[PDB]
């Protein structure tokens, strides 16, 4: 009834979707061929027999990742027509993914999404998985979000985006794509749960004892975050939280909608054996500045909204005591215009351990979505890099000779400056 | 340094390199020099197995303070050396390296 | 899908192309008779970018072998992997153009370029989705330089949106293999500046240094040098072909290393270069690969990057490795050498990672560098060119073939503009 459609764009989105759907199949007992040896309805559809087709599309402008999906262990899980692929990728170019290469694919993607929506009864919204500093993860994501806003102008559109890291980076033109995507989607998005590869690397090293993690472990952690977010739709709990609840409780103003994701019980097997992870402990770990999965120090800013999504053996009184302890803390400061900055969700299903993963089996877990003004510093860094590269006008010819104008660069930079000003304004205390 | 013939040629080839500071020194360059010495001297007529383990390591100044051979050993034979004989040989190899360059300096002055 | 048309011009181009097709067939498990004898399915997953499937499941390289003399054609045909190319793709003439750029660009290059253009049009119309072209040639040669230039210009005006990238062997600083090398090199570079997207400048003397000092080769022949160049070409288009954690085709590399249209000259490289003696003493890790590829001794052009600043670099890794190690090595390289990277381009490194390493290796990587040290090579070419042109030496050949001194002046002015742009940036 509360069906939701997940859209995975680009290599980052497709691989995170691989991890997410592996986790969903494990959680709901669905075999990797769609058969089982309700709860599995907001994300899967039943076709006559036991076949459960996931309610998602995998769209990329490059055949490689989608073909890996098509021939992997989950080759028979996804509908072959919902694994949409192009011929030539966007080559880390926003213009290619938005204007030149993305226009030859957007119609097919919209047709498939319309088929999925028609197959649904009540559509809660969309989950868009993508990366900020990619070609199709930026241009095609922005194009798709604007087309969805044109079509489904009322359904919520939550996006899980890999924010560029402060120091580590795999591409040279990431600031351009990030600024342009922020412009276009900020026009047409509800809330964007943000994450950094560098922060997850640090989390893995410090907590999971892994010194050489790959993208696979990062995707597993992100999939755990997404599972914690969607558990209320997929399972039954004391306090249910829907997508509209996220949108309402985490977005104070239409432009300030970039919360940061966190996951407390990130722990290895032996350490989990030696610990007694409780509600208070996991909450304190969530509010620890070193456990943030976006490399921004929360002490540099003020929280405006927090969404604590507990799951498993969790008692509401313990949650209330832990939240009261957090509020009594002095290092954790909130904005003065949000006397109540905690949306609490509790689910009865403990997190499922993926066979072959690094996370240990725990009795309870919490995912914390925090909207804070500490993201303003990350925005400032991103626009500073954009300003340097645009002042030298580097790489601009690649974007211009592909259906874009330098005026769009200037407009996107001005919009980002306005966003920084808005963050500064909401940061200050009322007088 | 029980060979003598091989260490002689090896001190003539590392002279143009180690005089530079350590910051410009990178391990991937010296191996070609070591391999050249083992080919020119009498150490070429030798068991290929033991020659597979003899390499260089970079201690962490000047090039005459961070160069030293290692001869790593793993497997069953590693139960005789036990990571302590390899932490003692290198403790010895410095004293035999210094007392070897302090001599080839004094035969250059002469 | 993303098919590449490979054109080999001249002796240098034909020999390097023969080695390149040998290594590519090794990667894809193609028999020298054209049959697939490989083991993994990924070899045939993207065989189409370089090969065309014939009738009896035999794979014919999408290569055009063009030369103005038949000796190289006969040598390529008679040797191993010579029965691999299509016999209709050997387009050659009789007179070998000498070492004259004008002969290969204006007198015999005309007829031979009409024929090779017909062949290239057929090959392109056969393709499903053309990614671009790649040319192997030498700038200091005869038919090689001039004819590669003419083909580049004509194919560019026919296919302007495709990626045209060339692996050109530039003249060496110390010893020249051709007396008229500066003239041919200057004219070829003047034509390459405007009609090419990616020019990988390779010098034979840097390759000799690599073979003698890094590979400890006692008698390095042209086979080894061509193997190195082929490994670089492999690495790039392997990032294109095989699956990986972070893909990058030719166009992505072109976007990430060409900040300005005329600044598209690169110094290639290859990380896992070890002598047979030292292969047992060296640990094959991402830090080792990075330290070797960023070493000034490994770069395949005789231009010291310490004399300039890296506009951009590209690291194409191959093999199963951790993305965190790659990114942390990239960050450490940028931080340590902050004085050797341009300040107005943050994150001067473009990282691609492929899952399939080259045969016989566990890890590998190719380094592409857009640095302002190519200005040294162009400066050397300019001094030699102006030294010969001031007294008008060996010029009557070029004039008699049908050229003019105004063309020489334009070529040297364009190359001086190139060095001015590099020095400015």
> How far apart (Å, rounded) are the C-alpha atoms in residues A346 and C170?
68
Spatial neighbors of B109 by CB under 8 A, at least 6 apart, are none
Report phi then psi at A335, rounded to 5: -65, 150
For residues C397 and C415, membership in a common domain is answered with yes
Number of H helices, E strands in chain B: 7, 2
For residues C367 and C416, membership in a common domain is answered with no
Tokens of C151: 């083909």
Cα B46 to chain centroid, rounded = 17
Distance, in angstroms, between C296 CA and closest chain B CA?
A: 11
Distance, in angstroms, between A184 CA and closest chain C CA?
A: 22
Nearest to C263 by CA among C316, C173, C196: C196
Q: Which experiment gave this structure?
A: cryo-EM
> How far apart (Å, rounded) are the C-alpha atoms in residues A206 and A190?
33
Tokens of C67: 């030369």
Whether the CB-CB separation of A94 and A125 falls below 8 Å is answered with: no
For residues C347 and C222, membership in a common domain is answered with no
Strand partners, C270: C366
Nearest to A155 by CA among A247, A240, A250: A247
Interface list for C 264-293 with B (CB within 8 A): 274-275, 277-278, 280-282, 288, 291-292
Written in H, E and C, the secondary structure of chain A is CEEEEEEEEHHHHHHHHHHHHHHHHHHHCCCCCCCCCCHHHCCEEECCCCCEEECEEEEECCHHHHHHHHHCCCCCCCCHHHEEECCCCCCCCHHHHHHHCHHHCHHHHHHHHHHHHHHCCEEEEEEEEEECCCHHHHHHHHHHHHHHHHHCCCCEEEEEEECCCCCCCCCCCHHHHHHHHHHHHHHCCCEEEEECHHHHHHHHHHHCCCCCCCHHHHHHHHHHHHHHHHHHHHCCCCECCCHHHHHHHHCCCCCCCCCECEECCCCCHHHHHHCCCCHHHHHHHHCCHHHECCCCCHHHCCEEEEEEEEEECCCHHHHHHHHHHHHHCCCCCECCCCCCCEEEEEECCCCCCCCCCCCCCCCEEEEEEEEECCHHHHHHHHHHHHHHHHHCCCCHHHHHCCCCCHHHHHHHHHHHHHHHHHHHHHHCCCC
Nearest to C186 by CA among C396, C13, C378: C378
Helix, strand, or coil here: C325?
helix
> How far apart (Å, rounded) are the C-alpha atoms in residues A381 and A99?
27
For residues C392 and C311, membership in a common domain is answered with no
Whether the CB-CB separation of C135 and C156 falls below 8 Å is answered with: no
Strand partners, C168: C137, C201
Tokens of A231: 């558990």
Question: Which of A91, A212, A383 would you mutate first to test chain C, the one with the most C CBs within 10 A?
Answer: A91
Whether the CB-CB separation of A328 and A364 falls below 8 Å is answered with: no
CA distances from A358 to A12, A211, C138, C151 (A): 20, 12, 53, 56
> How far apart (Å, rounded) are the C-alpha atoms in residues B30 and B36?
10
Whether the CB-CB separation of A134 and A60 falls below 8 Å is answered with: no
Chains A and B touch (3+ CB pairs under 8 A): no
Tokens of A281: 């402990």
Look-up: residue for tokens 């949306």?
Answer: A343
CATH of the domain at C366: 3.30.1330.20
Tokens of C90: 């050997």
For residues C223 and C321, membership in a common domain is answered with no
Strand order in the sheet with C349-354: C349-354, C310-318, C364-371
Report phi then psi at B62, rounded to 5: -145, 165
C359, C374, C389 - which closes a domain: C374
Tokens of C277: 């003696």
Look-up: residue for tokens 């080769």?
Answer: C217
For residues C280 and C208, membership in a common domain is answered with no
Task: Point out the residue among B28, B32, B52 whose CB comes nearest to the CB of C291.
Answer: B28
Q: Do C249 and A89 touch (CB under 8 A)?
A: yes
**Number of domains forming the structure of chain C:** 3
For residues C98 and C222, membership in a common domain is answered with yes
Q: Does B98 touch chain C (CB under 8 A)?
A: no
> How far apart (Å, rounded) are the C-alpha atoms in residues C321 and A262?
27
Whether the CB-CB separation of C209 and C297 falls below 8 Å is answered with: yes
Tokens of A76: 């028979």
Whether the CB-CB separation of A375 and A260 falls below 8 Å is answered with: yes
Strand ranges in C229-375 using DSSP code E only, listed in sequence order = 265-266, 310-318, 349-354, 364-371
For residues C142 and C290, membership in a common domain is answered with no
Known binding residue C292? Answer is no
Nearest to C328 by CA among C273, C285, C268, C267: C285
For residues C210 and C321, membership in a common domain is answered with no
CA distances from C139 to C68, C100, C101 (A): 15, 11, 9
Structural domain boundaries enclosing C245: 3-257
CATH of the domain at C183: 3.40.50.1440
DSSP notation for C155-168: HHHH-TTSEEEEEE
Strand partners, A156: A125
C232, C257, C282 - which closes a domain: C257
Q: Does B12 touch chain C (CB under 8 A)?
A: no
> How far apart (Å, rounded) are the C-alpha atoms in residues C288 and C383?
38
State whether the Cα torsion C137-C142-C147-C149 is positive or negative. Answer: positive
Written in H, E and C, the secondary structure of C201-228 is EEEHHHHHHHHHHHCCCCCCCHHHHHHH
> How far apart (Å, rounded) are the C-alpha atoms in residues A209 and A212?
9
For residues C238 and C381, membership in a common domain is answered with no
For residues C229 and C337, membership in a common domain is answered with no
CA distances from A274 to A10, A277, A353 (A): 40, 9, 18
C257, C283, C310 - which closes a domain: C257
């Amino acid at each position: 009834m509360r069906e939701c459609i997940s859209i995975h764009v680009g290599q980052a989105g497709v691989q995170i979707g691989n991890a997410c759907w592996e986790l969903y199949c494990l959680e709901h007992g669905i075999q990797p061929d769609g058969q089982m040896p309700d709860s599995f309805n907001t994300f899967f559809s039943e076709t006559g027999a036991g076949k459960h087709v996931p309610r998602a599309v995998f769209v990329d402008l490059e055949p490689t990742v989608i073909d890996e999906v098509r021939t992997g262990t989950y080759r028979q899980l996804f509908h072959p027509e919902q694994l949409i692929t192009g011929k030539e990728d966007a080559a880390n170019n926003y213009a290619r993914g938005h204007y030149t290469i993305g226009k030859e694919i957007i119609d097919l993607v919209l047709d498939r999404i319309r088929k999925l929506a028609d197959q649904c009864t009540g559509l809660q919204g969309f989950l868009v998985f993508h990366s900020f500093g990619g070609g199709t993860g930026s241009g095609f994501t922005s194009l798709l979000m604007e087309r969805l806003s044109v079509d489904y102008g009322k359904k919520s559109k939550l996006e899980f985006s890999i924010y560029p890291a402060p120091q580590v980076s795999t591409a040279v033109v990431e600031p351009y794509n990030s600024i342009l995507t922020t412009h276009t989607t900020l026009e047409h998005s509800d809330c964007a749960f943000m994450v950094d590869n560098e922060a997850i690397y640090d989390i893995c090293r410090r907590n999971l004892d892994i010194e050489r993690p790959t993208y696979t472990n990062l995707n597993r952690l992100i999939s755990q975050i997404v599972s914690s977010i969607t558990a209320s739709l997929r399972f039954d709990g004391a306090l249910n939280v829907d997508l509209t609840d996220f949108q309402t409780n985490l977005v104070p103003y239409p432009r300030i909608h970039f919360p940061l994701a966190t996951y407390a019980p990130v722990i290895s097997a032996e350490k989990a054996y030696h610990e007694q992870l409780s509600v208070a402990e996991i909450t304190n770990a969530c509010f620890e500045p070193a456990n943030q999965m976006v490399k921004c120090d929360p002490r540099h800013g003020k929280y405006m909204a927090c969404c604590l999504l507990y799951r498993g053996d969790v008692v509401p009184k313990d949650v209330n005591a832990a939240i009261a302890t957090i509020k009594t803390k002095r290092s954790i400061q909130f904005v003065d215009w949000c006397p109540t900055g905690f949306k609490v969700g509790i689910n009865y299903q403990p997190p499922t351990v993926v066979p072959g993963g690094d996370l240990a089996k725990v009795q309870r877990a919490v995912c914390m979505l925090s909207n804070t003004t500490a993201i303003a510093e990350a925005w400032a860094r991103l626009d500073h890099k954009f300003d340097l590269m645009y002042a030298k006008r580097a790489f601009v010819h690649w974007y211009v000779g592909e259906g874009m104008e330098e005026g769009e660069f200037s407009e996107a930079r001005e919009d980002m400056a306005a966003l920084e000003k808005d963050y500064e304004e909401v940061g200050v205390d009322s007088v | 340094l029980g060979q003598g013939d091989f260490i002689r040629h090896l001190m003539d080839l590392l002279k143009p390199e180690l005089v530079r500071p350590a910051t410009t020194l990178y391990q991937h360059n010296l191996t070609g020099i070591l391999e050249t010495a083992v080919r020119a001297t009498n150490a070429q007529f030798d068991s290929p197995e033991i020659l597979r383990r003899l390499d260089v390591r970079l201690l962490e100044d000047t090039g005459w303070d961070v160069f030293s051979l290692d001869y790593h050993v793993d497997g069953p034979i590693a139960t005789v050396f036990t990571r302590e004989c390899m932490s003692h040989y290198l403790r010895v190899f410095n004293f035999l390296w210094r007392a070897k360059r302090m001599e080839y300096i004094l035969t250059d002055i002469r | 899908m993303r098919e590449i048309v490979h054109i080999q011009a001249g002796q240098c181009g034909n020999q390097i192309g023969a080695k390149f097709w040998e290594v590519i067939s090794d990667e894809h498990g193609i028999d020298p008779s054209g049959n697939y004898v490989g083991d993994s399915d990924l070899q045939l997953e993207r065989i189409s970018v370089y090969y065309n499937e014939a009738s009896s499941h035999k794979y014919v390289p999408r290569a055009i072998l063009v030369d103005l003399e038949p000796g190289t054609m006969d040598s390529v045909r008679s040797g191993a992997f010579g029965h691999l190319f299509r016999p209709d793709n050997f387009i050659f003439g009789q007179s070998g153009a000498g070492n004259n750029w004008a002969k290969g660009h204006y007198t015999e290059g005309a007829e031979l370029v009409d024929s090779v253009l017909d062949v290239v049009r057929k090959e392109c119309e056969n393709c499903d989705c053309l990614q671009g072209f790649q040319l192997t040639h030498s700038l200091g040669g005869g038919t090689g330089s001039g004819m590669g230039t003419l083909l580049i210009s004509k194919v560019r005006e026919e296919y302007p949106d495709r990626i045209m990238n060339t692996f050109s062997v530039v003249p060496s600083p110390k010893v020249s293999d051709t007396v008229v090398e500066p003239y041919n090199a200057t004219l070829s570079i003047h034509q390459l500046v405007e009609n090419t997207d990616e020019t990988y400048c390779i010098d034979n003397e840097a390759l000799y240094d690599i073979c003698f000092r890094t590979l400890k080769l006692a008698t390095p022949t042209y086979g080894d040098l061509n193997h190195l160049v082929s490994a670089t070409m492999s690495g790039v288009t392997t990032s294109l072909r095989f699956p990986g954690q972070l893909n990058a085709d030719l166009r992505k590399l072109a976007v990430n290393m060409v900040p300005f249209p005329r600044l598209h000259f690169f110094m290639p490289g290859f990380a896992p270069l070890t002598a047979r003696g030292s292969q047992q003493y060296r640990a094959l890790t991402v830090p080792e690969l990075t330290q070797q590829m960023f070493d000034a001794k490994n770069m395949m052009a005789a231009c010291d990057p310490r004399h300039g600043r890296y506009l951009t670099v590209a690291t194409v890794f191959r093999g199963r490795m951790s993305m965190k190690e790659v990114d942390e090595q990239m960050l450490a390289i940028q931080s340590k050498n902050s004085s050797y990277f341009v300040e107005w381009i943050p994150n001067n490194v473009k990282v691609a990672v492929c899952d399939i390493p080259p045969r016989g290796l566990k890890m590998s990587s190719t380094f592409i560098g857009n640095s302002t040290a190519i200005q040294e090579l162009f400066k050397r070419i300019s001094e030699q060119f102006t030294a010969m042109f001031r007294r008008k030496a060996f010029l009557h050949w070029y004039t008699g073939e049908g050229m003019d001194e105004m063309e020489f002046t334009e070529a040297e002015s364009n190359m001086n503009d190139l060095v001015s742009e590099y020095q400015q940036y």
